[PDB]
Design an enzyme around this catalytic site. Structure first.
Site, short mmCIF file in Angstrom:
data_model
loop_
_atom_site.label_atom_id
_atom_site.label_comp_id
_atom_site.label_asym_id
_atom_site.label_seq_id
_atom_site.Cartn_x
_atom_site.Cartn_y
_atom_site.Cartn_z
N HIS B 41 0.49 -1.17 -0.02
CA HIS B 41 0.22 0.24 0.05
C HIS B 41 1.17 1.85 -0.29
CE1 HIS B 41 -0.20 0.07 4.49
NE2 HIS B 41 0.05 0.93 4.40
N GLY B 143 2.48 6.14 9.85
CA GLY B 143 3.67 5.84 9.44
C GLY B 143 4.30 4.29 9.60
N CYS B 145 3.46 1.56 9.40
CA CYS B 145 3.39 0.57 8.44
C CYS B 145 4.38 0.24 8.06
CB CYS B 145 2.49 0.93 7.17
SG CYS B 145 1.36 1.07 7.69
C1 LIG Z 1 -3.91 4.91 9.35
C2 LIG Z 1 -2.83 3.76 10.42
C3 LIG Z 1 -2.63 3.57 11.55
C4 LIG Z 1 -1.98 1.97 12.18
N1 LIG Z 1 -1.25 1.12 12.00
C5 LIG Z 1 -1.82 1.72 10.32
C6 LIG Z 1 -2.26 2.49 9.82
N2 LIG Z 1 -2.45 2.66 8.04
C7 LIG Z 1 -4.04 1.85 7.90
O1 LIG Z 1 -4.52 1.19 8.37
C8 LIG Z 1 -3.60 1.88 5.95
C9 LIG Z 1 -5.28 0.90 6.09
C10 LIG Z 1 -5.24 1.14 4.28
C11 LIG Z 1 -5.56 2.30 3.14
C12 LIG Z 1 -6.10 1.88 2.19
C13 LIG Z 1 -4.83 1.02 1.24
C14 LIG Z 1 -4.09 0.04 2.38
C15 LIG Z 1 -4.69 -0.13 3.81
F1 LIG Z 1 -3.86 -1.35 4.01
#
Ligand SMILES: Cc1ccncc1NC(=O)CCc1ccccc1F
Ligand SMILES: Cc1ccncc1NC(=O)CCc1ccccc1F
Lengths: 304, 304
Positions: B41, B143, B145
């Protein structure tokens, strides 16, 4: 989101761990620049345990009696000295992995990470608080002496603790990196009173703020309190009296959440007086006091 | 003595963390040999969020669009490919800090350490369990990920998790290092059901053994039970059914303490039916399930 009891990344400290053997005793040493620091009790034998005369025991030792091995390479000891309860072994080679570092004496109620080691090899890392009575509730077995506690500020490692003892109660005691014990403890095999401990109030409040930030809010109420009223409850429940310096340090969390510090004190007062009622806060069924307000801010903002 | 939620020393993993930027998105990558692994992603923009067509998004990218920086040095990308939900960026330089490593798919109920990172920089380390429903309850912000979970067997790092998502419930989801999600999750900004979770029974029993080893024994009783009777209670309280394979894995702890597994099950049955009565076990006011029997043995014996 989510909130965990997170330790600092231990890499910078792992590169400093060495094994120190003197006679038949082996423990851990910390190799920074051209000096290896370790607990002075590495020079004791089983008969010396009760009340060692460290000055006399050290006089029987020469540089060549201190065997220092950094993983698998042997260090050459060119000097030795005792500073309080630590030994400083001068070696002929500066540690190439020496990070930027400071030696600091932490205050009771502050937190730090411990890298538990055996025979100079790291086994695990965990975060803990220095109790108000200057003990730590760690996880240490025989051989872990010389393991260290530290904090990291980007690239700088502030070493604050070196492990020396397990009290008969199963709690732990140690020194700053100049060998001064935290608390009243002496490095002898003697039963030693740890003072009356208290719960670190400012950390519990910081953790209640971390709970609200992460969605755990059931404990928020319609009440407020004063420092005086709150301190009567803190007294009854063996909590540290809250001061304006503590309220000041909670300012960033109060500003972020919009919950005034005394309103959070009223939630804490209600939880002290009524318990959790079989509910949890951030996965805990008790009031957690091992996160400082700085820890909460760092964790909640993503500091590296 | 003492028992802590200890993470593995993170040094070997810290040396593998890099930052990966594609377009305006930055996340973490894991650099092992001449390959950088990161969540696919990283190639999405805000409009793509709901249901990205990853094959089409990746077709618009060339090797030079993937900016990989290992701390402060730039890596040259000479290949890219998508494997399940991960991207593999071939670089022209093998990581000099690559530890001995394996990629493993862990089972639900097993534990591992997470090194939380932001912009390729490690911020902290914590231990957690893969829930029976394949989520993890971590501490991750935007951030994070690309942060990874792992276990260490002396010199070998077994990478088991890469972080991808925070579900709307605040729990976390990710993949093995081949990019296969644990659980039913897909990498889309969509509300996704995590299954019914259960408490990891064998880990709670392992932790009750760790408690007895460390002096917390108040919960031991005069009773015993059977797997059948215990499993009726486990059913009522949403605990994993205990099997002979679990009893077998608890053998070392039963042998060390002399407390037969079914007798410990009777203590656990009484605690489930009656609660803690305002008491604690190893500093917890709830039944802890994030220590496996292997973790308890490792911690209680001093494994490095
Ligand atoms: C914001 C955050 C906070 C903590 N851990 C992770 C995150 N990030 C997500 O959940 C990203 C979600 C996502 C959206 C669109 C496409 C792919 C995808 F995996
Ligand atoms: C056995 C153990 C376990 C965990 N942490 C630490 C330890 N070790 C000790 O308490 C050593 C006690 C001691 C005895 C004689 C002279 C000096 C001295 F500090």
């Amino acid at each position: 989101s989510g909130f965990r009891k997170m330790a600092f990344p231990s890499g910078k400290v792992e590169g400093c761990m060495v094994q120190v053997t003197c006679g038949t005793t082996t423990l851990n040493g910390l190799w920074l620049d051209d000096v290896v620091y370790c607990p002075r009790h590495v020079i004791c034998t089983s008969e010396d345990m009760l009340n060692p005369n460290y000055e006399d025991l050290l006089i029987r030792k020469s540089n060549h009696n201190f065997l220092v091995q950094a993983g698998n390479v042997q260090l050459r000891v060119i000097g030795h000295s005792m500073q309080n309860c630590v030994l400083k072994l001068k070696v002929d080679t500066a540690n190439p992995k020496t990070p930027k570092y400071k030696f600091v004496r932490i205050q009771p109620g502050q937190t730090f990470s411990v890298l538990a080691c055996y025979n100079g090899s790291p086994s695990g890392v965990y975060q803990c608080a220095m109790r108000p009575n200057f003990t730590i509730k760690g996880s240490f077995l025989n051989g872990s002496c010389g393991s260290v506690g530290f904090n990291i500020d980007y690239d700088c490692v502030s070493f604050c603790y070196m492990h020396h003892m397990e009290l008969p109660t199963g709690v732990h005691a140690g020194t700053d990196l100049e060998g001064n014990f935290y608390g009243p403890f002496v490095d002898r095999q003697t039963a030693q009173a740890a003072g009356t401990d208290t719960t670190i109030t400012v950390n519990v409040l910081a953790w209640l703020y971390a709970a609200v930030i992460n969605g755990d809010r059931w404990f928020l109420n319609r009440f407020t309190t004063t420092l005086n009223d709150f301190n009567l409850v803190a007294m009854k429940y063996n909590y540290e009296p809250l001061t304006q310096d503590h309220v000041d340090i909670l300012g960033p969390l109060s500003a972020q959440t919009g919950i005034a510090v005394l309103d959070m004190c009223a939630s804490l007062k209600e939880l002290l007086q009524n318990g959790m009622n079989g509910r949890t806060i951030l996965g805990s069924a008790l009031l957690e006091d091992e996160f400082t307000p700085f820890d909460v801010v760092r964790q909640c903002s993503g500091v590296t």
